[PDB]
Design an enzyme around this catalytic site. Structure first.
Site, mmCIF file in Angstrom:
data_model
loop_
_atom_site.group_PDB
_atom_site.id
_atom_site.type_symbol
_atom_site.label_atom_id
_atom_site.label_comp_id
_atom_site.label_asym_id
_atom_site.label_seq_id
_atom_site.Cartn_x
_atom_site.Cartn_y
_atom_site.Cartn_z
ATOM 1 N N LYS A 1 -11.526 -3.126 -0.919
ATOM 2 C CA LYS A 1 -10.562 -2.306 -1.623
ATOM 3 C C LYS A 1 -10.606 -2.454 -3.133
ATOM 4 C CE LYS A 1 -7.437 -3.548 1.489
ATOM 5 N NZ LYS A 1 -8.106 -3.519 2.828
ATOM 6 N N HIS B 1 -4.868 -5.450 -2.116
ATOM 7 C CA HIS B 1 -4.950 -4.396 -3.109
ATOM 8 C C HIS B 1 -4.938 -4.929 -4.527
ATOM 9 C CE1 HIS B 1 -4.404 -1.207 -0.135
ATOM 10 N NE2 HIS B 1 -3.556 -2.030 0.453
ATOM 11 N N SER C 1 0.827 -1.198 0.000
ATOM 12 C CA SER C 1 0.000 0.000 0.000
ATOM 13 C C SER C 1 0.861 1.248 0.000
ATOM 14 C CB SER C 1 -0.928 -0.018 1.206
ATOM 15 O OG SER C 1 -1.753 1.125 1.204
#
Lengths: 139, 491, 491, 139
Positions: B332, B300, B272
């Site tokens: 996400k 992610h 991230s």
């Protein structure tokens, strides 16, 4: 997080210029003499490197290791305890160079020997690797 | 075929990541910025030896051993408390492309806040995990959950191995297994709770865990809860990976020299902070060379990599059957809540029994299951699979655009997360206020969650961002990076 | 039951061995005796820089790199060559109780000898391995081999896995297996050649051997030929045995830390020098505690210990089925030549295949097989099993007799070998001449085959020795121990 | 067999009395002085302990290890090479005591400092454990 804080980039370069500022500050004082400028700046430096390495223990932030180094001062916790590293030896060579320039200046006097040695003494004594966790009757 | 360089890591495409080392003159000024700030903290706490108002530990019948360390709260009240106006701002709308933000301020110097009444509207956000643009209260995608909400309700009052097990739960666990292309799958309540309750059900006392430098608070915590030796290798350093991996087998424990029971690796797809992709085929080639296992984290990465985005495995075009266990979330890319674990049917059944969470924690809410399902249906085929081609266009456009504007960007170029480098701690505190004046809300990342000379800001790109939405933001940044001289790069 | 002290070593009888530490004043005088002798050696070899006559390396067409180290031959020509008249004397009779010795002398100071003509007759010997008194050319025991000699011949010209395999060989290999009480047995050509050719056929590269300080030149050599790690423990020190035995398992090799492949122990029953018996039940109890094996060596012990003497196992009354492999000879109680190996039938068959000696070396001579058989028949039931009760009477009488006469004796009291302590190197060279004047020939043991302050003399008792033969020797020793003041003991 | 030769019984006691004989021999010399008796006996002792430890290599007998220590002098091969043992340290303390009595006698002269130091120097220099196998251009 206090284990990679002296293992960073250019912290060595910035550690010099703090002292280099501190001397030029102490060089421009009216009622002072050019020997006891060097006497003063070897006392203050070795005062800082005791209080900021061997006295305050823990982290200014909060450690996610549940406070493992809560009882450990900042020198003891560098690089997760492995002593002979690339950055602890830089922190030991530097007061010696600050001992020898203050040996060069003040012209090798006797009181400038006495006052500028025990500061250099009391900073290297905790930096003995066999003095890792022993604390003299306190702290 | 692109690179087969030394470890057998077979590459199809060029890799092209960029970790520009920080300049010498920039780095020295940072420590001065902290050095003046650490100076006043000892000044301020010395002034507090007599009585910005504090939380004031109860005097009434207390004053035992004190609760907190005064010194462990140093950075939170002398560097954080000064500039904590940002990354905490309440929003009052759908976090899509334009976001209504409630305005607040403090005359007590950020020690106590106050909403005025104001709703700052049409604010372009770049700090939400809204990659595929499923945060909307419109369209037929979210409408399907409204039928589910009026029918079922908003949560089981039970557990999976207990009563609470709906048909939707059984449906979704099938549905992801075809989506990932693996045998079986199982959903969990939240994505944090997955790693902190299932990784201890895998490894035991004699295991060894090889995790990255910067995983998450999830993956560390699961590694703490399983009593198991944890060893850290450098970030995307296969040479440093193999060096630990070599010595892990030719030695054993530190105390005894017995062999390890089993070992495995904790890596993430898209990290991230410093948004970068792991050198994955060099990992697949290396774990087969040393018989290790592999835990992968597509928190992610899924919905963001590969065509019709299916995580990093399709992005490297590889097979799902070499990753021993796959984990990702639904917060996400999907605009939902929870996470899964994909894996072999033998593995899933062991975790349908030894789970810490199917046996204690309550399961998902029913309508958010539907929001996951209809989102995967629009991906698998209606705002569908065209937006991932839009986001990769938006990624690749925006990534070259700030690099040529003299800014400094980390990570792989194809990564949707845009880490933008600040260095000075005052430049943290100005930049969040500065962009908010220019009608844009972003996320700045502080000191202790970084190293010292990282202190970056971060941009989350989105397929919901069009070109005009994106270029308007490009115009605003051009002034601010000029205004704060944060043009650190040489190129 | 006598002792079960700490290791579970269950004792039936009292043990009663005696290792009296050497006196302070005696030990200092020894080094002076060597110190003057090492002094003249450098003097003598310095005198040899010009030219007791030497062997004189050929000059004719030679003088390459020289053959020997001059310095490694130091002790053999300056301490040995001075007094080498004894332990080399040719005898010309049957080595029974009285032995005809050819007389020799040297006017060249022991550098070249000369027989005069003389045969010194009726000399009581105490330096031959003639325990059960089977060295005689009389009686029906040796007469049976004369029928075998006139029939068969004096040696196969072949090998065991080749042609040469007689019925006597098959008979004897049975016969010992019932004698030992084990499954199967196999004879070999000489007792030295057994250990140097079969121990390498057992242990391999990853093995570990735990041998005593003072085994033999056999057992060391077999341990050198098998490439295997050799570790030495102290003599009859179970505490030092277990300490190595503990660390042998909780560590592995020095380089790698892998487990050992298999480990075993090399011990002897009756150690020839310092005649003592191993603390055997403390060994059986310890090898079961650590899963080690055990190689045992009844070279001296068989025919000398236990009633109707069957080695140390009957002497401790234990079972033959806990010793993994038993070895002994036929030269040292039976008056024959060769040795056996007793063991399990699975073990023997592996060694009937992988032998180094049944596949290369020629086998036993036929008539000496018969001398073994008829001797075991007189033991198993005609000068038979009454003589072992005679020898144990002769042992126990002679062992208390010199101890009360102010001499110093090592080893267990029931051990037939009598180690008599000299200390001074001149007292070595006088004592062999002195007893030979008093019509008795004994064996003195020099420096390098001992430690420095041991330098002892040794007596082999015999069942062929009667009381009058034994007491006459007691009278002669009483003068000599007075004459040389070798009354070192305090008691 | 030269590995248990100083690990024997009373060899330490006999090593003293050889020197104690050597002094009383050197004490009864007519044309000599009571300083240079001590100067002589510290030279001869440190000559012997070099030649009998650090020069002759191998064994006077024949080693059944096929001449493994053929290239090894007698100090190097004590106790199968493990340095910090109970008997090597006795062999290092003893010339120091022979240095201090010869420091006490001759009344701390300058030539008696020079001649009696380099004998004590050249005997302890090979007894450095990190000077195990290094041989200076020869032997």
């Amino acid at each position: 997080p206090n284990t990679r804080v002296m293992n960073s980039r250019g912290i060595w370069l910035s550690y010099v210029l703090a002292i280099g500022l501190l001397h030029i500050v102490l060089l421009s004082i009216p009622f002072v003499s050019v020997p006891v400028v060097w006497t003063l700046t070897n006392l203050i430096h070795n005062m800082g490197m005791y209080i900021f390495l061997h006295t305050v223990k823990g982290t200014p932030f909060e450690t996610p290791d549940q406070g493992k180094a809560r009882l450990l001062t900042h020198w003891e916790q560098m690089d997760y305890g492995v002593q002979f590293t690339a950055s602890r030896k830089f922190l030991t060579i530097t007061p010696i160079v600050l001992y020898f320039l203050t040996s060069f200046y003040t012209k090798y006097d006797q009181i400038h020997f006495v006052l500028n040695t025990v500061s250099l003494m009391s900073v290297l004594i905790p930096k003995l690797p066999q003095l890792h966790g022993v604390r003299i009757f306190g702290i | 075929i692109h690179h087969v360089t030394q470890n057998g890591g077979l590459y199809k495409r060029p890799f092209n990541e960029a970790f520009e080392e920080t300049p010498m003159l920039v780095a020295v000024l940072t420590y001065v910025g902290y050095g003046v700030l650490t100076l006043f903290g000892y000044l301020r706490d010395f002034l507090r030896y007599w009585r910005c108002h504090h939380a004031t530990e109860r005097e009434e019948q207390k004053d035992f051993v004190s609760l907190y360390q005064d010194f462990e709260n140093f950075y939170t009240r002398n560097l954080y408390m000064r500039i904590r106006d940002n990354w905490n701002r309440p929003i009052c709308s759908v976090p899509g492309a334009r976001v209504d933000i409630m305005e607040r301020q403090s005359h007590d110097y950020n020690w106590s806040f106050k909403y005025t009444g104001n709703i700052i509207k049409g604010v372009i956000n770049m700090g939400s995990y809204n990659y595929l643009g499923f945060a909307r209260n419109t369209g037929s995608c979210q409408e399907a959950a409204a039928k589910v909400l009026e029918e079922y309700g908003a949560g089981v009052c039970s557990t999976r191995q207990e009563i609470g097990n709906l048909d939707k739960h059984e449906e979704l666990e099938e549905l992801v297994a075809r989506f990932l292309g693996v045998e079986a799958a199982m959903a969990y309540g939240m994505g944090f709770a997955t790693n902190s309750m299932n990784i201890p059900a895998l490894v035991g006392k004699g295991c060894l865990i090889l995790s990255d430098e910067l995983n998450h608070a999830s993956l560390v915590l699961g590694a703490r809860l399983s009593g198991a030796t944890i060893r850290i290798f450098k970030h995307n350093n296969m040479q440093s990976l193999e060096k630990l991996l070599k010595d892990a087998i030719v030695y054993g424990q530190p105390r005894t020299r017995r062999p390890w029971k089993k070992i495995l690796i904790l890596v993430e797809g898209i990290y991230s902070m410093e948004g970068s992709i792991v050198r994955l085929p060099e990992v697949i080639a290396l774990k087969k060379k040393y018989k290790a296992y592999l835990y992968l984290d597509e928190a992610h990465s899924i919905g963001a990599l590969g065509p019709t985005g299916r995580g990093v495995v399709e992005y490297f075009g590889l097979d799902p059957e070499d990753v021993d266990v796959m984990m990702g979330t639904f917060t996400k890319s999907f605009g939902a809540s929870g996470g899964y674990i994909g894996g072999k049917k033998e593995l899933i059944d062991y975790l349908r029994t030894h789970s810490h969470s199917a046996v204690y924690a309550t399961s998902l809410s029913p309508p958010v299951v539907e929001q996951i399902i209809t989102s995967m249906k629009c991906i698998m085929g209606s705002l569908g699979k065209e937006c991932v081609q839009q986001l990769a266009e938006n990624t690749r456009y925006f990534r070259r655009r700030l690099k040529e504007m003299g800014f400094i960007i980390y990570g792989n170029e194809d990564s949707p997360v845009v880490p933008l480098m600040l260095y000075m701690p005052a430049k943290i505190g100005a930049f969040g206020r500065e962009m908010l004046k220019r009608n844009i809300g972003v996320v700045v990342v502080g000191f202790p969650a970084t190293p010292i000379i990282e202190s970056r800001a971060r941009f989350c790109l989105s397929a919901a961002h069009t070109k005009e939405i994106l270029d308007t933001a490009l115009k605003e940044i051009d002034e601010v990076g000029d205004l704060l001289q944060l043009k650190y790069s040489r190129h």
